[PDB]
Design an enzyme around this catalytic site. Structure first.
Site, short mmCIF file in Angstrom:
data_model
loop_
_atom_site.label_atom_id
_atom_site.label_comp_id
_atom_site.label_asym_id
_atom_site.label_seq_id
_atom_site.Cartn_x
_atom_site.Cartn_y
_atom_site.Cartn_z
CG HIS A 74 -0.44 -0.06 2.60
ND1 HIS A 74 -0.02 0.79 3.04
CD2 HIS A 74 -0.68 -1.28 3.29
CE1 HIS A 74 0.47 0.11 4.45
NE2 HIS A 74 0.11 -0.58 5.02
CB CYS A 105 1.17 -3.82 4.56
SG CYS A 105 -0.23 -4.63 5.24
#
Lengths: 165, 165
Positions: free
Chosen positions: A124, A140
């Site tokens: 992301h 992440c």
């Protein structure tokens, strides 16, 4: 086309379904023979996803180097800096796929979210640009917003992502 | 029963689908009239989920107090300490629902993961017990493993979760 998944030791029907964002029932329907349980090393179909192996793009992530490298047929096309997981919440290693995406997720996710085939993990953007290039994430992979936008504009769902130390 | 969702200003068809872990197509099928777009304040159906309003349990989260309080028909039954989001990645406030769950997620998620109706957010356990009672999370609500196990054993999917400062 179909996506084929190689069952790993430790996988359960529940965990595979969660990794691919599907129900165990859907997983069972696509693989009737699983009615007798799982076996490490066997291959199964994940319903609803494209074939990763017709896609000429491939993404390589280095946790140590803090880079995400995009290749087209073995030719490097882009290299981006990334944030990766801190010690108690590391970025997982292994072979994964991009399985879906969401534009404009906002918050810590910034301009784009791309789901990886590990439950709760993705690539992301960020609302904290200073974090890029550091091991400070929950696991992440974070990118500068401009970079995740560019990455998403290039690669389709199904794209292979290989994560190494 | 059916779950009814109150559309909020800012919601898009894409964002609602992501919040409830479904496709925009499924959302559109359950609400044919959405073929003409969305309107803040209107109510719509979220397919595949139970009716929150027949469930006598209700969860209240206080970010300030760092507590999650479980009630049964207005009677407090349990109070648990929690970790909440740090300043750049705060826990969101408002009305949410528990929409699914995963046992044994492991890693930073500990013993159980309960999905909330905000994309990428949930209530989970932890591999870092010292973090409980602190504003150190990415936004998710963290609990001691024993506590999230107990919570999950009591409340069904669809359970209302109200998050306040």
């Amino acid at each position: 086309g179909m996506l084929t998944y190689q069952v790993k030791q430790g996988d359960t029907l529940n965990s595979i379904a969660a990794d691919f964002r599907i129900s165990t029932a859907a997983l069972l329907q696509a693989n009737p023979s699983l009615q007798a349980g799982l076996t490490a090393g066997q291959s199964i179909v994940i319903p609803g996803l494209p074939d990763p192996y017709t896609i000429p793009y491939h993404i390589a992530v280095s946790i140590g180097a803090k880079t995400l490298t995009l290749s087209l047929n073995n030719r490097v096309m882009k290299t981006y800096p990334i944030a990766v997981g801190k010690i108690l919440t590391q970025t997982p290693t292994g072979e994964f796929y991009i399985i879906n995406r969401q534009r404009n997720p906002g918050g810590p996710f910034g301009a784009y979210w791309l789901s990886l085939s590990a439950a709760h993990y993705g690539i992301h953007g960020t609302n904290n640009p200073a974090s890029i290039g550091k091991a400070v994430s929950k696991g992440c992979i974070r990118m500068h917003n401009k970079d995740v936008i560019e990455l998403a504009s290039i690669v389709p769902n199904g794209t292979r992502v290989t994560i190494n130390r």
